[PDB]
Each structure stands twice: as C-alpha cells, then as structure tokens.
C-alpha cells in the first residue's frame with residue numbers, strides 16, 4: 184500500500200526531471216567555468232542554454248543579465264515541478280485552484296531544496312551541466328543581486344551534508360508541495376491528510392535506505408522549516424528589486440507568484 188505510494192512518487196520524479204542528483208554530483212566531481220565577465224560572455228556565445236539568449240529581454244547590465252538567467256532556471260523548474268505534482272494521483276485529485284495554491288507557495292521551497300544537488304561550496308552548475316558559475320563571481324555582482332544569491336549557497340551546502348539520494352528527494356519534494364499550511368487553501372483537511380501520508384512514506388523509506396543514519400527524519404523536518412524562512416527572506420528581497428530596480432524585468436509567472 185504505502186510501498187507503492189512511494190514508488191509512484193519516485194517514478195514521477197524520474198519522469199518529469201531531467202538531471203538527477205546522482206548525475207549532478209558526478210559532474211561536480213568537465214564543465215566550462217564562468218568566473219568573470221569574459222568567461223560569462225564566452226559561455227553565452229559558446230554553451231547551449233535551454234533558453235536562447237535572443238529570447239531574453241533587452242540587455243541592461245551584467246548583474247541584470249545573470250538575474251535573467253536565474254529566472255530562466257526557476258521558471259523552467261516550476262514547469263517541471265508542476266508536471267511532477269500532476270503525476271501524483273492524490274495531487275491531481277484536488278480541485279485545480281488548490282493545485283495552484285500549493286504550487287504558488289511551494290515551488291520556491293522545492294526549488295531551493297532540489298537544486299541544492301547542483302551546488303557545492305565553490306559554485307553551481309548551469310546550462311544543463313555544461314557550465315559552472317563560481318560563488319565568488321556571483322558574490323561580485325552589485326547589490327541587491329549578490330544579496331539574493333548567497334543565502335541559497337549556505338542552505339545548499341548544509342543540505343547536501345545530509346547525503347540524500349534521489350529516492351529520498353522525491354518524497355521530500357512531494358512533502359514540500361503537499362503542505363496544509365499554505366494561505367488560501369480550500370480543502371485543508373484533505374491536503375493535511377496527504378502530507379501526513381507522504382511524511383509517513385518518507386520515514387519508512389529513510390529507515391530502510393539509511394539504516395545507520397542518526398536523527399535523519401527530524402533533521403529533514405527542520406530543513407522544511409529552514410526552507411520556509413529562506414523563501415520568506417527571498418520574497419522580501421524580490422519585492423525590493425521590484426521596488427527599486429524598475430529597469431529589471433520579472434517573468435510574468437513570477438510576477439503572479441510574488442503578486443502579494
């Protein structure tokens with residue numbers, strides 16, 4: 184019963200996401216390194232990006248350009264997370280408006296967790312694993328763009344120290360999205376009941392896949408709390424960019440996510 188619930192979620196994870204954590208870490212341990220303006224120009228003229236540079240909004244400056252590449256990945260990851268959730272029968276049985284509520288308030292927590300896999304202390308992978316942007320370069324961008332990036336590195340390296348595999352992540356992501364505390368949810372008891380079953384699946388999976396791990400499941404529940412604070416800080420910083428970087432465009436889907 185529950186063993187099949189989990190594997191249904193695991194198959195949805197493998198089907199709807201392109202790069203696994205296993206692949207990400209193997210690459211991280213070669214990609215073209217982006218560490219300065221010159222290598223960023225070469226990467227944009229040399230590497231193959233999911234989003235064609237010509238499709239981005241008009242050029243404004245280096246910091247803004249990186250910010251647009253950031254939006255490309257988060258919007259692409261929202262797309263995959265939406266198909267991942269829709270491949271979960273219990274998620275698809277909710278009314279469409281509750282599905283949107285859960286994605287609206289959940290995808291960024293999910294993004295900052297799942298994409299921790301492509302990050303290490305030195306930087307993170309870009310361009311489908313073909314590039315590697317250095318943390319030092321991202322820190323050298325001008326405020327406020329350097330400010331929004333650093334907190335995610337601190338989380339990702341502490342998160343990666345838990346050594347979750349893709350099977351753990353699949354359940355963990357499902358649990359983030361199916362969260363009963365999201366504002367404006369219609370059928371709270373149903374979402375709460377689904378989240379509880381996912382968490383029960385998570386614990387059963389962990390104690391089998393990580394029999395010698397100490398306190399791993401409560402450690403992950405604390406990371407769910409951390410992610411909420413991370414996203415809260417992120418949304419505050421995004422509202423400051425909207426306010427004072429009027430020249431910077433925001434993808435319409437993210438405008439809808441941050442509309443409040």
Ligand SMILES: O=C(O)CCCCCOc1ccccc1CN(Cc1ccccc1)C(=O)c1ccc(-c2ccsc2)cc1
Nearest residue numbers: 249252253254256257294295298299302309316331332335
């Ligand atoms: O709110 C939104 O969704 C839009 C506003 C996002 C602003 C904050 O974005 C980031 C902050 C910290 C780290 C990474 C990202 C963005 N990001 C997702 C992510 C990956 C790991 C962990 C958490 C998130 C990326 O994958 C990424 C893609 C491209 C580049 C790049 C390309 C050429 S020069 C730089 C750099 C990063």
